[PDB]
Structure formats: C-alpha cells, structure tokens
Copies of this chain bind each other. A is one copy, B any other.
Amino acid sequence: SLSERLKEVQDAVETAMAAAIGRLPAGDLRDAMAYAAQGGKRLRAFLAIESAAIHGISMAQAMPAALAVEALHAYSLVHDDMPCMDNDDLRRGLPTVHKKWDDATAVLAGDALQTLAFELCTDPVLGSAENRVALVAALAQASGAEGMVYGQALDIAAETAAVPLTLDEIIRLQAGKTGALISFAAQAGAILAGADRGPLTAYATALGLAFQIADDILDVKATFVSLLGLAGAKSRAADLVAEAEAALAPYGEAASTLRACARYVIER
C-alpha cells in the first residue's frame, strides 16, 4: 500500500521534525523554522526511507536523512516564496513565512533550516562516519550551485527573459531545481548501506523529470506543456516513469514500493 506507507512516513516525519527543531533555543527564528517544516506530502523523506528499506535499513536508522532532506526542501521554499523571488503570499492555503513574520525572518529561517539539514547528516544513528560524510557530500552536491540553487537561479532568470527557453534549457533548469534533491533522497538508502548508487540515481533522474512534467500538466514562459504539447507532456511523463521502474530491476520485487511511487508522481 503506497498510500498507507506514504501516510506512515508523513506522521513519523512530522513528529520527528517537531522534536528536532524543538531543542533549538526559543524565539521567532525557531517558530518560523518549525512553521516552515510543518506538513507537506513528504515525497523526499519518503524516498530516503524507502531506499534505505531496500537495503535492509530501518526507518529509525534512516530518519535523520529523511529529516535532513525535508529540512533542506523547507528552507528552499521559505526563500523561494520571498517577494524578490516567487513572491507567494500563500503556501498550501496558509500565509508564507515572510508574510507571517517578515522578510528578514524568512531569510534567517531558511538559512538555519539549511544548517539544520547538514547537522542532521551527522547524527551517529545514521551509521559509520564514512557513510555520514558521503551523505553530507551528496546533500551538498544536490543543494548548491551545481544543483538546487543553480536551477533556481536559472528559473529566476527565465521568468524575465523575452525569448522562451528551449527544451534543452528547461531540462537543465529542472535537473538542478528539482531533479537534484530528489536524487539525493533516492540515493540516501544506498549511501547508508555503502552500496551501488547507480540504479537509484537512474530511477531518480527519470522520476525527477516525470515529477516536473506532471506539475506542469496540473498547472493547466516555456513549460513542458508549451514545449511538448499536452498529450506530448503526458506521454513523456509516462515513458520516464517506465524508465524509472526499469532502473530498479536489480532489486527485483523489493523495488515495488518505489515503482508505485514513480507511478503516483504522474497519477494525478
């Protein structure tokens, strides 16, 4: 059951995240962080826990990694919603951090949520120091100027430009903006097991692009719908989900929960 499993992960992450932030000193900065990290479908946390499971690793052992990726995701949104960025008053129908506190508080809460993500990677519950440093390196690659921040920067620049982006450009944007962090989550189980990262990386590359394509289809400047056509976007998204499922053939029947997740990304 993907839905039940998804629900179990959401509930476990919500409780754990609350606690993690709770031990920080009191104040507007902690409340803002706590608020930003509350809720969400928890896709990334799910991929970390699920990919750990495939390598026989418990949720309790995997949790700090799940927390770190949700923390990193949360901070990215806190900043992206800001006026000079995407300028969103609402996130899932509730006021954004910068609206509920101010712009200064949103800068600071996202800054500390990124710091929190990295701190979480150091928790010895995760396992050997060797796997933990590989975890930090992988998070940093995905989140920084080669991954997440780079694709945000491409996307901010795209929002202005009076020449729409090409397919090759929007693919590069999406690989960093969205693709990179999902790939971190998917590989996190392999990192913690000291195992081949290959299949989960390939899975994630396909899943990440299906994810963004699906977003665009529901969303009705170049998009996957404007570039590929509506039926063309839908067909691409389904072909990438099949590519993602095929990437997990090494794992046999144990890949079925991850195969279902890829299908879920586009089944809306």
Contact = CB atoms under 8 A, between A and B. Distances in A.
Interface of A: 24-25, 27-30, 33, 79, 82, 84-85, 102-105, 107-108, 110-112, 114-116, 118-119, 121-122, 128-130, 132-134, 136-137, 139-141, 143-146, 149-150, 152-154, 156-157
A29 to B, nearest CB: 4
Nearest to A24: B145
A145 B29 contact: yes
A33 to B, nearest CB: 6
Given A82-B107, A128-B129, 4 more contacts: A79-B107, A111-B149, A118-B139, A132-B133
Given A29-B150, A108-B156, A144 B115 contact: yes
Point out which of A121, A128, A141 has the most chain B C-beta atoms below 10 A from its C-beta: A121
Nearest to A139: B118
A146 B25 contact: yes
Contacts of A136: 118-119, 121-122, 133, 136
A84 B112 contact: no
A116 to B, nearest CB: 6
